[PDB]
Amino acid sequence: SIAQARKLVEQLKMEANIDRIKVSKAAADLMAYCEAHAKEDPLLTPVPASENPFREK
Amino acid sequence: KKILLPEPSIRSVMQKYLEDRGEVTFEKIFSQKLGYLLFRDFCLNHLEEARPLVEFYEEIKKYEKLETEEERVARSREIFDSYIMKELLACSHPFSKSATEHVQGHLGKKQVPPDLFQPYIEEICQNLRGDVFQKFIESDKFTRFCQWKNVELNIHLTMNDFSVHRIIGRGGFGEVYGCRKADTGKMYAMKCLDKKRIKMKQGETLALNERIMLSLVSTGDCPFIVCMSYAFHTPDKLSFILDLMNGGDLHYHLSQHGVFSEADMRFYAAEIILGLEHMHNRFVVYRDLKPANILLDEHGHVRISDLGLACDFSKKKPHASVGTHGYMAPEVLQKGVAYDSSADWFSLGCMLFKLLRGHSPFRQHKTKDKHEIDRMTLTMAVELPDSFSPELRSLLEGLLQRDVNRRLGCLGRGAQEVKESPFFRSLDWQMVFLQKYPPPLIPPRGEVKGIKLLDSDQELYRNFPLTISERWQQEVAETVFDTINAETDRLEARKKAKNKQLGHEEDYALGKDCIMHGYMSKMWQRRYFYLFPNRLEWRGEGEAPQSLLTMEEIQSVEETQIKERKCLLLKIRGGKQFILQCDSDPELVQWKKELRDAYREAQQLVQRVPKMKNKP
Amino acid sequence: SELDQLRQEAEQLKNQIRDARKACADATLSQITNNIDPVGRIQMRTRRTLRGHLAKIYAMHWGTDSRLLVSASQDGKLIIWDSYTTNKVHAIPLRSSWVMTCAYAPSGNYVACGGLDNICSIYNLKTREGNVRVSRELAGHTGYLSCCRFLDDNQIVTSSGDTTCALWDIETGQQTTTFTGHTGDVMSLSLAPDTRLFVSGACDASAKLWDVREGMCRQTFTGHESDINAICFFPNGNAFATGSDDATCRLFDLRADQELMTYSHDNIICGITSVSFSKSGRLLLAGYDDFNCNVWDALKADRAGVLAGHDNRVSCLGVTDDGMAVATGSWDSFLKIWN
């Protein structure tokens, strides 16, 4: 009844008490990751049939 | 024309069919002749924790059938100091002290009634019901039982199933024939009525009543009644399959042999009495007891024939005036008169009198009126010609009373009172039942359209087809049962060894959640189906199922008619439809049930599942 | 009362959490990525068609070798394929016909699955002597098993319709940790790269970040207006995507503790059933109930391409670890390898 209600606020306090970074920071890190691995993505840049296991290997 | 048992896979369908009707119990299977035969087979050959119990049970059954006390005195001792005895009382489950004390009590005092070891019987069953019976259900003997039960529950007789021979009697509606059933070879009598002349003379009231009375009577294997085994009909014929009696009736033999003596009459009367006690115990009145309805067999023994005019007084007493004149009791003849089995004890006296004199005791001087005998039955009291004996009179005096309150067999004990008459003092009724007495007369061998049927009249004979389970199983047991099992056994081992070579060897219906499986035909193509909680898979021979039908894909399951054959019609979502055809009626019933339960349950379930159900 | 402020106090933290998140919303992912070139039109072709399942396909999961993949179907079977040859390595009839999910152990030694039977079954592939049989039946959930993922050969995480998730010790066969918090059926879950965290998506329209060891909920993400059917981690593990019945995918960043972007189009009205990133995380592939698989620009939120090769719902998909191909499972009983 109230033991669960007591349970809820304790959870919210644990979720409220966290360090948050700026979205500008987090968004840049994501973009930086994509750029640093764009060359390793076969779905992004279609690879030669020689290196494609589903075409000619 | 030979009997072909369905493959053991029929168990999957049959077991669910029987359990639905609660037919899968120890008592219900044990009570059946084929059921018992297969059960004893399993117990005597594939389970020794019950072998000695079955051996002892059969020894008691042999003992029960011994006639003379001379035999039972010796056998009772042999059975007691038998060492099947101290093989049971010297092992897992011995007989109770209270049971043994009763047996050795009667056995010691030198009285050996046929029901001597009855206390042992019940304790044996109390030991067979349960764990032992559960092991039987799991055995392949119950599987074979399902194979036989499938054949029985799928009996559809036609004139092609019988080899009809010479005529052996005629009636107002049809004829009687000597025939031989094709699959077993059992000699039967085929009473073929004709709906044309039936509807004409207003006879379906009798044709139906005879079929119902035969049902109430054709149980117990009574040696003194022409009992029915099967009942079926063609487009124009009503057919009863009855006991074969190719010896003519008594009215024929009476007029050709002359009047019978008291000794010759005592024979027929004795057998006729047992035939009456049979019906009366099953609350059935014959009402039409006359010399013409008494058939003789090849050996001269007799049976009561034509139950067309019989009645049931189990819950509702009869009243109307029915029967042949001169043989009708005052009670019945009196209408509005609740009159029961007391009407046959009167007809017996009238009939026996005609065997002695040559006519009814109320039809004097060739009179041909029909108020006729009704005057003398109610008013006058028939008074013997003193040619009879003091005992013969003492019988007919009691049988031909007008008072049911003072008539022989109507003052509490029924037939037991008639058997007790001084006229039958010389007879052993046990040996009368066994037909041990010599018949007085042994029959010489080899002698003795502008109407339309509407469908509504054909709807009177809707539930006419019937099959006495006791009769059919008995017929099978005493003919083809053992040999058919032998062939079927090796034919199944043959398929198994072949599947060994080919390599599988592993059942598709095991280790899963399969609900049921078996053969069906789609559209025709015959495939093996597997019913799961969410789909219906099927396959041909030579590979596991490549096709199926999801339960969610099924809309309805309706029974439809095609070529006079019942089929299951499956309506599928895409406006399509799927039609199935079962090999037997039991399979049609179970598949329609299991399929309806399956798709309704599945669709009910899928709707509650986010990932499974259909979204906008 | 004493339930007086415990509901008011609870509301205030929700305001503060929302306030703390707004304080971090200094810019958008869309604004940050306006300088990088678009991925252009993404176009793939079917390299393989896996035929075998007799009914609907509900789930699939790639092996770590980017060659073997397992799939669960309505026909009550698990099939382990060789995507290169399309040959079947294993066909595993299940004890229950109501399977909804399946998983492939990173070692390749085991595959797991479950459904309406409310249990997660572990299957040993490299066997005792030759065959393939049930090695463990994880019982505990009071609801159906919606998803499961191997941490290793003796640890697996599961989500259920019983509202909860759970960490299992396969050897002992009991639940090491229970993750309670959701208020609706948990539909999917995804393991972080470090396998020290994992996110879940339930029918309460919320995703939760869990600590595997401490067994606690660390962060809660909302925004969706309906059931979350699928969820997946971004390659670096600092973010994850979600698929909902609201016809929208969404990107959530952990360190920012909020949503970064929404992937949708006015033409797309059907629900998402599965989500997955390309190797670089630049592409967000999602399966839809309109028989299609839309490819989204994860950074710019544009629809780059569309995989249209099924005649029924795309119920699942997955990108290989080497990023060489995408597999799509459908209600048409077919799996296709796109490239």
Ligand SMILES: O=c1c2cc(-c3cn[nH]c3)ccc2ncn1Cc1ccccc1
């Ligand atoms: O039932 C019989 C009958 C039975 C047998 C018989 C029984 N078993 N074997 C042979 C023999 C002669 C018969 N003659 C006449 N009826 C009455 C009847 C006949 C037909 C239609 C209606 C009533």
